[PDB]
Design a protein around this motif. Structure first.
Motif, PDB file in Angstrom:
ATOM      1  N   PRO A   1       3.195  -6.346 -15.418  1.00 20.18           N
ATOM      2  CA  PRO A   1       1.914  -6.185 -16.116  1.00 20.18           C
ATOM      3  C   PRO A   1       1.720  -7.295 -17.134  1.00 20.18           C
ATOM      4  CG  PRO A   1       3.466  -4.471 -16.782  1.00 20.18           C
ATOM      5  CD  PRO A   1       4.144  -5.257 -15.707  1.00 20.18           C
ATOM      6  N   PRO A   2       0.478  -7.587 -17.528  1.00 19.15           N
ATOM      7  CA  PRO A   2       0.227  -8.795 -18.334  1.00 19.15           C
ATOM      8  C   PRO A   2       0.781  -8.741 -19.748  1.00 19.15           C
ATOM      9  CG  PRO A   2      -1.781  -7.524 -18.056  1.00 19.15           C
ATOM     10  CD  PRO A   2      -0.776  -6.930 -17.117  1.00 19.15           C
TER      11      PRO A   2
ATOM     12  N   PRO B   1       4.606  -0.787 -14.507  1.00 17.50           N
ATOM     13  CA  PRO B   1       3.786  -0.914 -13.295  1.00 17.50           C
ATOM     14  C   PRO B   1       3.841  -2.348 -12.790  1.00 17.50           C
ATOM     15  CG  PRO B   1       2.389  -0.653 -15.250  1.00 17.50           C
ATOM     16  CD  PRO B   1       3.806  -0.424 -15.694  1.00 17.50           C
ATOM     17  N   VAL B   2       4.161  -2.504 -11.516  1.00 22.53           N
ATOM     18  CA  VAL B   2       4.198  -3.812 -10.873  1.00 22.53           C
ATOM     19  C   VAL B   2       3.037  -3.879  -9.899  1.00 22.53           C
ATOM     20  CG1 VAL B   2       5.534  -5.373  -9.401  1.00 22.53           C
ATOM     21  CG2 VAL B   2       6.657  -4.007 -11.135  1.00 22.53           C
ATOM     22  N   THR B   3       2.382  -5.035  -9.841  1.00 23.88           N
ATOM     23  CA  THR B   3       1.335  -5.287  -8.865  1.00 23.88           C
ATOM     24  C   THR B   3       1.825  -6.314  -7.856  1.00 23.88           C
ATOM     25  OG1 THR B   3       0.265  -7.050 -10.154  1.00 23.88           O
ATOM     26  CG2 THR B   3      -0.466  -4.770 -10.580  1.00 23.88           C
ATOM     27  N   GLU B   4       1.054  -6.481  -6.790  1.00 23.69           N
ATOM     28  CA  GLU B   4       1.306  -7.506  -5.790  1.00 23.69           C
ATOM     29  C   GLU B   4       0.122  -8.459  -5.820  1.00 23.69           C
ATOM     30  OE1 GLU B   4       2.973  -6.367  -1.797  1.00 23.69           O
ATOM     31  OE2 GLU B   4       1.187  -7.451  -1.097  1.00 23.69           O
ATOM     32  N   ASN B   5       0.382  -9.728  -6.134  1.00 27.81           N
ATOM     33  CA  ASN B   5      -0.703 -10.693  -6.260  1.00 27.81           C
ATOM     34  C   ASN B   5      -1.217 -11.107  -4.878  1.00 27.81           C
ATOM     35  OD1 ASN B   5       0.925 -12.782  -5.290  1.00 27.81           O
ATOM     36  ND2 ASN B   5       1.344 -13.637  -7.337  1.00 27.81           N
ATOM     37  N   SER B   6      -2.202 -12.014  -4.863  1.00 29.93           N
ATOM     38  CA  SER B   6      -2.861 -12.355  -3.607  1.00 29.93           C
ATOM     39  C   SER B   6      -1.957 -13.114  -2.642  1.00 29.93           C
ATOM     40  CB  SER B   6      -4.144 -13.146  -3.869  1.00 29.93           C
ATOM     41  OG  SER B   6      -3.860 -14.423  -4.411  1.00 29.93           O
TER      42      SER B   6
END
Ligand SMILES: C[C@@H]1O[C@@H](Oc2c(-c3ccc(O)c(O)c3)oc3cc(O)cc(O)c3c2=O)[C@H](O)[C@H](O)[C@H]1O
Ligand SMILES: C[C@@H]1O[C@@H](Oc2c(-c3ccc(O)c(O)c3)oc3cc(O)cc(O)c3c2=O)[C@H](O)[C@H](O)[C@H]1O
Ligand SMILES: NC(=O)c1cccnc1
Ligand SMILES: NC(=O)c1cccnc1
Ligand SMILES: [Cl-]
Ligand SMILES: [Cl-]
Ligand SMILES: [Cl-]
Lengths: 469, 468
Positions: free
Chosen positions: A328-329, A316-321
């Motif tokens: 993922p961490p 899972p990839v997120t998009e930061n601010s």
């Protein structure tokens, strides 16, 4: 160690070459004005002063040893036995030298006096430049510390841009250079200079050097995590790479673990072994204990970009601010092959162009960090600028016709702040006029004693980046 | 020195990573193929004696390593039990066997130069613990090899322009003491250069050779009196002539090198040496010539212009090969900007302008001892064989993106080929005895240095073909 045998051979003959009745030779070190390397971290002199210059450094046995070696080396008697015996007899073998220096960790523009050396007894006019060779080796910790700091500037710029903060910056450039330097002594010196800027090192020799010569409030100045090498993967047999990976991450399930993943096919390892077969052992890990996947071959930028694309499709990839992609961490990447200041820049810029946050990556650098540097990078140079002969001070310098860059400073020197807060080196004793306040150099060595010292914590504070300040 | 603290941090953790039931780890060093076609093997004996032999483990050293690693890893991962086993069972002597090609041997790239293996199954983890310290042999290997390659260039040009190799051993002088990264590096690097040449100002090399290798002669390297900018400029700019006169008179019966570029190298050659002080130069003996030293400007352009000036102020002869030759009391040393590439450029430029290489020597500092990396010869240490559950398996790495990084498989041996070349046999095939004697010899076993070589032997092994 014998200081008498610790100089360039030709310096053994120099006492016979200075003008008769010379009572003072005064010399200075600078990083001559010529990645531009516009400012240098002054670091490493305190090691040299304590290990090699302080205390009783002359004995009868050392004089006799030097006399015997030089008689054969020159096939002639030129060694200044009387001059060294004078130091032994009058000063109990302590060097009648005064060294003044800018505080360690200070960040100083090129072309400024960093330290000065002069004899404190007129009989020892020849001693000032005897010790040039040992003192000029400070080029190495200066250059490692400066080049490491310049890489920190690049990392900070791109981390700030892609993440909005500097969290984790001090672990982004890990010292892999122990095997790739020229000696055990160099490993300790160079690793300690890198630790001025970062906290991650595998060059264990740097820890004891810092403890012995500088000191930190913390138990150790640098840290590491468990990591694999090719031997610990390949020993399982090629058909059992998955078994090696599974064993290693399970052995180190509660701390971060780096696993070199390119023994046979880095892309298969990421997509199929980490990505599919062992994915359940990765997504279960703690944020304080990520898997760090380590490529180690191929084009450094191309490999990092393809590894990230593979992992971004399996995890899972997120998009930061800031709009950048973030793994993922429990999952990170370390690129530890082919890294120097130039390829570091290329990789972070390439990641940025592909919308990957610098949070995702760290770098290991070995030869590029500690060995691929020379005294010419910062033009580190030691030259006589002032002598007293027949009781008269003379401002002296070199000015080669073919090369203006090699021109040296004249007379007694001092380092000052300008009205705008920058640095200026005043020549010809003009610091005495007090138009620029007090000299910033401090006496650090006098007559065999270290007179001023800096902890490693103070050096780190002095070397901070503006972006950090 | 504490060998427990002399490895890459991650190797502290490797004992937990090898396959269970592994009783042997066998590893090897090569200068991988990727011009530097052949390498001088030199420097392992220093490492064996200074760092690896004898009682290298003590209870204090184990406790100190345990304490440091607890803080360094923020965890307890150090193999205290395994190190205490060595202390109690072997009085702290390493159960390791190292086999190596004789020092001084010149070996083509891509061949095994030494192997390492544990001699006690409990110490399977020890073979690669010591990789970091052994891989630092890259440095003396690379200095010796690069210095030898410069000797080849010098020999070819000297032979062509002079008809012989007289003086070759003094044509590349080590100026590198100030330009290396440490005192220890200075001694190691200077000793490696002395495999090929006899001129050095890096005094530290002498004591290293005496302690670890040995020569029949009292010293392995030599120097002559020489000036530096401080001893010229201290006289004042208007008194450069007085400095020159004083220095050549102080050293009137030995060779003397005088740096001549403090203010204007070309003025110094043409007017000071060539006119004002000419009478002090032409009177000098052949055994004690004046060596003029430029130290700035474009290295080739400066050498050619210095020679042109001197050729017009001093009697020049033409040797039997047709090349110009300064009188025997006058020579030049170029000691600025010299590395293997500029050395080649300078001798070729001299040849094109019809100047014999007899006229010149070179000083090299950073280029000789500091501007080199482990990547130049691709010096690398890898595991090639393990025994797990009593069965030997051939181990290797073969990265998909880089075929050059593929490592050798199995137990290795080095042999002469029928045509007199070299071959590394893999997979234990040396046991078939189709290729004569393995050239690797045991040099270290169970804490003892088994075989040693003198510096004189090393020099003989490293001789050039042209010299032969
Ligand atoms: C997985 C990371 O480990 C630690 O940082 C290091 C990194 C690192 C790696 C990738 C990243 O994206 C990154 O931000 C950092 O890697 C290391 C590798 C080693 O061989 C030894 C180390 O100590 C670290 C090392 O200390 C820090 O704990 C960091 O917070 C954590 O994210
Ligand atoms: C004056 C020369 O000295 C000796 O060689 C050296 C040279 C040299 C110089 C120029 C040439 O064209 C050349 O063929 C050699 O230079 C040295 C410089 C140093 O600083 C120290 C040395 O030991 C030599 C050093 O030993 C040689 O014995 C040579 O026969 C002689 O011509
Ligand atoms: N920790 C590592 O991955 C490492 C350390 C030193 C050299 N190469 C790799
Ligand atoms: N002898 C020399 O001319 C010399 C030695 C070391 C460094 N630079 C010059
Ligand atoms: Cl590795
Ligand atoms: Cl003990
Ligand atoms: Cl000089």
């Amino acid at each position: 160690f014998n200081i008498l045998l610790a100089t360039d051979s030709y310096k053994v003959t120099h006492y016979k070459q200075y003008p008769p009745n010379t009572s003072k030779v005064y010399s200075y070190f600078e990083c001559r004005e010529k990645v531009k390397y516009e400012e240098t971290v002054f670091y490493g002199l305190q090691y040299i002063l304590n290990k090699y210059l302080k205390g009783k450094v002359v004995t009868k046995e050392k004089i006799q040893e030097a006399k015997d070696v030089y008689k054969e080396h020159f096939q002639d008697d030129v060694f200044n036995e009387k001059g060294w015996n004078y130091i032994l007899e009058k000063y109990d073998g302590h060097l009648p030298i005064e060294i003044k220096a800018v505080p360690e960790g200070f960040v100083i523009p090129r072309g400024n006096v960093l330290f000065t050396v002069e004899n404190t007894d007129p009989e020892c006019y020849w001693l000032t430049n005897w010790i040039e060779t040992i003192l000029v080796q400070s080029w190495y910790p200066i250059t490692v510390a400066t080049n490491s700091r310049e890489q920190k500037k690049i990392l900070a710029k791109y981390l700030l841009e892609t993440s909005g903060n500097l969290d984790g910056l001090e672990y982004k450039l890990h010292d892999f250079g122990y095997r790739g330097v020229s000696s055990q002594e160099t490993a300790g010196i160079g690793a300690s200079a890198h630790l001025v800027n970062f906290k991650g090192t595998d060059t264990v020799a740097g820890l004891a050097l810092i403890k012995k010569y500088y000191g930190t409030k913390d138990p150790v100045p640098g840290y590491s995590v468990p990591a694999a090498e090719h031997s610990t993967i390949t020993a399982w047999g090629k058909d059992h790479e998955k078994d090696a990976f599974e064993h290693i991450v399970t052995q180190f399930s509660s701390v971060p673990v780096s696993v070199v993943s390119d023994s046979y096919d880095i892309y298969n390892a990421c997509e199929k072994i980490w990505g599919e077969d062992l994915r359940h052992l990765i997504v279960s890990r703690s944020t304080q204990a990520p898997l760090i996947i380590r490529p180690d071959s191929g084009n450094p930028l191309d490999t990092v970009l393809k590894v990230l694309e593979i992992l971004g499709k399996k995890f899972p990839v997120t998009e930061n601010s800031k709009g950048y992609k973030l793994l993922p961490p429990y999952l990170r990447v370390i690129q530890g092959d082919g890294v120097d200041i130039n390829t570091l820049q290329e990789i972070v810029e390439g990641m940025k162009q592909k919308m990957w946050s610098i949070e995702n990556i760290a770098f290991g650098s070995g030869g590029g960090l500690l060995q691929k540097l020379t005294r010419d990078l910062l033009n580190c140079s030691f030259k006589c600028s002032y002598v007293v002969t027949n009781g008269l001070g003379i401002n002296v310098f070199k000015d080669p016709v073919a090369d203006p860059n090699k021109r040296s400073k004249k007379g007694r020197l001092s380092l000052h702040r300008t009205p705008a807060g920058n640095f200026v080196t005043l020549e010809e004793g003009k610091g005495d006029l007090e138009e620029y306040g007090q000299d910033l150099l401090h006496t650090v060595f006098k007559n065999g004693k270290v007179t001023k010292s800096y902890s490693f914590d103070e050096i780190r504070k002095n070397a901070q980046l503006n972006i950090e300040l």
